[model samples]
Target: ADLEDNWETLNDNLKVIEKADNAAQVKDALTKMRAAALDAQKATPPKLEDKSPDSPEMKDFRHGFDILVGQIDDALKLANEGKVKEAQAAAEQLKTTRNAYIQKYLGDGARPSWVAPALSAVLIVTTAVDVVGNLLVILSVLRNRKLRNAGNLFLVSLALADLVVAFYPYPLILVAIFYDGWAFGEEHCKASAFVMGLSVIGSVWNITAIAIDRYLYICHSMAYHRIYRRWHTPLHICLIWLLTVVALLPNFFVGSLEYDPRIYSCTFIQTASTQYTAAVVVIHFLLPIAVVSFCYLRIWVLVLQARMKKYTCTVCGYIYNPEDGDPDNGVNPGTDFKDIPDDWVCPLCGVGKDQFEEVECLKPSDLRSFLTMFVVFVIFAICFAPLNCIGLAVAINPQEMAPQIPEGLFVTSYLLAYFNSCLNPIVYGLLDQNFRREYKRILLALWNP
Candidate 1:
């Protein structure tokens, strides 16, 4: 009964506490004011208990407090009205309160020494592996005479593209990853990306050409012999490389240095105006994947329909990379590999002549199937598709989403795809028995002499 009568008295107490001159003193005054409120509530039948931390009422109360605190600008403005005493007093109080709150809630920031160095080690290792692997493959091709051929010349073109990727952007990539900045400025960034882009497109197209050639030779041997005569491989390879170079001409022409002011790096300053990074993504990644899928699907369907003869050294099909043999390079084996035995000769050169005599030349249907589902097709899909999709998606609308992507994740994924350049030599050189034996012969002759 006494508490109920004192309700008005309690309301007056809260008003008095709220108007305290000093912000710090107001905190203490509110505590006494709250106790008076509780006593008055206790006198009523519908008395209010202290709210739980997660209760709806408590959330609303906290939200109201946050709004009130955020609107301190009005008080700050009044302090700035040429009142030296109020300004000095308010500033000192704010500094003291902020420091105290920070000390109570947050810890100091410090980093361990080893973190920076470990990241540096990774960047160096990745750069070395990508750069060195391409160089080794090129050396292998150039050094061997028996390995030269028109088909392999296309491979040389492919290698050049991959080599640019391995070498030029590496320093900048290292800089970007290590320092988290593009310190090389703008011109180099766009040029490097453009060069790499060109090479990448060239590589994809070269693979496409190889697939198409293989399809013709394997599936339609008789018609292939008539239409795909001498000089065709050279013409195709030249055209593919030219197309790739032309594809990226616009990128080279456009001049813009992408600068991230906050991070202080300059790269290709691509905005939406950068003329279709999205379209390039589709052209390079999606189109190639689609083409490969079509070729391989056709190849696979043919293979499935035909009964593959028993594994015979004589009649199995062959894949020839155009870069392998050249008359000038002295790798021109005096004889064509068509007559070689599959067992007595390298499986890559052709089914060995002896093996060829036993089995039929691959039928058109069989050739089509094999070309479509070739293991190389699988490699292309696995290594190329994901990265292309990523680049495409990002380029479509990079401004808002770019920074949000984890830098480390992007680097790692790119490196994984980049490793394709290294894996190619294995697929092209080692899997094809002819290239393998030839590479071995070249190595042995080098050491033996």
Candidate 2:
């Protein structure tokens, strides 16, 4: 009765679909029908019941279902156009598609087809957002004088990586997701995957560089002003790209870069070789994460004396966070500044006690810096962790674990990882005033100009 009701539900929607006035009504019924199809997927047909849910046989069963869904969307498109005759003609393919895939996968009778254009649509929106948003990030730094700070130099590299991924890899992968196969041939499969590595690793080191620079500016401020020169940032940015290229260079020799059918992306396949993958994971993700984390750890530790907030050595950017006063030199944790023997010098710069200027919460520009760093760490934890951990596992036991992991998890993890690119500008916009200013200028420029 349970399975029968699901079948009944399918026909119920089928009736609505056939009687629909336009494609909109057809789509509504098909959408309902799509759900029932998914629900019915819970039960395995008697013949295929022996196979595990993640087995190839079961996947073939689902692919057969997606074929049916894709066909209905095809017919629905024409029906919405007022071409009733053409719509019916397209629906004819629905029967052929269902029969063909059912026979191909199961060699038996069961409905098949599904709508995954929705996922494709998501990729489309993400692509658009990445392009516009990242362009603004790059443009904000370029046009806004205040935003041209040293840390933002790495930010611009990150934006460029974000922008290029949208242009090069995203459009291809969008179509790959839509078409349900890599249609662009092997050359592009290789090219896009390579480009993806460039973007992914380049941004990793970009954030890594920014993290270290921020640490310098906050902890060792005098050294920051001296080392982080006007031309120094671009030189560092250049080295980041150079090293990023070197990082990906092994793919040429190892041939690990290949089409990932699970995510419809050409990327470094973790299961290619456990030894090689483990090495790459360490080099590509672990090292960068390590450096970024270490710098962040030290900054948080050094600055977090008392909410990490207090007076400044205006001469050298040392923060005299008062909660943990200079105990090593005899000042206790709770010692108030005035009560302290009035002879202590500004620790780093050796300026006299009178020059110990009181610090505001932040200099606003400094507040923006703090915000960007905070968000980057959030992105690191949220977006970067899952995918890399999964890859690391695959590196550990590719033979056993690779087969055990479902394609569903693979696609989900891959999606979240790439989603990092599209998130940058919005995150920056919220943090930086110049980002907002340039954002408005670009949008409102056409109207006023």
Candidate 3:
């Protein structure tokens, strides 16, 4: 097992050497590689049953490692004496030298040729899709009136975290693919790696928060309505980031943020140990997965029951269903959730239950649903449909209408279509609170300056 460990450490150090940006980095990786080399020298290959340490091929393998150790020491000596450029050039030969020995001795154990290309293809698309997709999510949530629910606020924060990767570390990965080295300074190297850590931790917690939010809405049903106040969601978002910041404190202790040659970015180094590995795995990944799993598991079963039970709630944000037939103005039994609806009415002052009834799951189509459910669709149909009715008339029957239609009327019709575009920014500025604040900041900044 330790022989396997020694080889694993040897491989990791080799990767570090391949990715090292300067003389000091190469020296650091090569120094560790040297010790692993010495450990590896004692091991016999698995297939070489007859070829023990004294065997001809095994003797040559050990001899090759010894020569590498000597070369490693020479390289380190040069780097230590500040002959970094010369040391780096000397360090370059180690890969070739190791390859010669490996090919001659450990013939079948060499790395395959297609690994780099395949991985490059994958990260390219990942970098491409993640940036624009997450950016668009924020923008869509921003101006779309139906999207501005408190719940979507969580998704918007998640998108913000997802977008951070594309801006810093992921782009650096693209740079490394093209440049074949990290040209940025070490300060940036460490910062981007930690920011990458920030995103991962934020993603986990955001997903966990979203899961719990959903679990509350679906399973507890009434508790979600009663407990959710206006500022509660936004404040909870900050708490997620707060917990993420504390989670990162552990990495500051155990981290070795170095450039990874394979991925071409500075990333946290994994440990070969058990204790911190288990701690980090459980804390950062497994624990969150378990929490989310439990939340989602409860949701699935509850959702299945709710669906089969024809469990439609009183869309009144406060007065929700409590697993009974009809509610009354009298004493309620399963009023665990919405019992406080009327009692807590004064707490949500200026915000009526009727007002919040339609506010929870606001989707873009709901503006139409609101229209269709009432008769507002006919009002908006008056806005644009008749103007386009002439175009549809001209679209098919232009010959008959061509002589009758005036160019001034056609000009007005097309201008009205352009007016639709103009009306959008105006409507968004007025009604879209998310976009409204941004617009206020943007245009106000000019006047203030």
In order, the Cα lDDT scores of the candidates are: 0.50, 0.70, 0.56
Q: Once model 2 is optimally superposed onto the true structure by TM-score, how far is the C-alpha of residue 191 displaced, in angstroms?
A: 0.1
lDDT (10s digit) by residue, model 1, range 29-135: 33443454445333322222354556675454444423323323333444335443453344333323323321221122233354344445654664565465555
| C-alpha-based local distance difference test score of model 2 | 0.70
Tens digit per residue, CA lDDT, model 3, 197-241? 777667667767766765665565545565754799889999999
- lDDT winner among the candidates? 2
RMSD, candidate 1, Å: 18.1
Could you give the candidate ranking by lDDT, starting with the highest? Answer: 2, 3, 1
Q: For candidate 2, list the clashing residue pairs, or say none.
A: 23-80, 65-112, 65-113, 66-113, 66-114, 67-113, 68-113, 69-113, 69-114
Instruction: Report the poorest 10 consecutive residues by lDDT, candidate 2.
Output: 106-115
Clashing pairs in 3: none
Query: Which one wins by TM-score: 1 or 2?
Result: 2
TM-score of 2: 0.64
Q: Please provide TM-scores, in order, for all candidate models, with all chains considered together.
A: 0.53, 0.64, 0.48
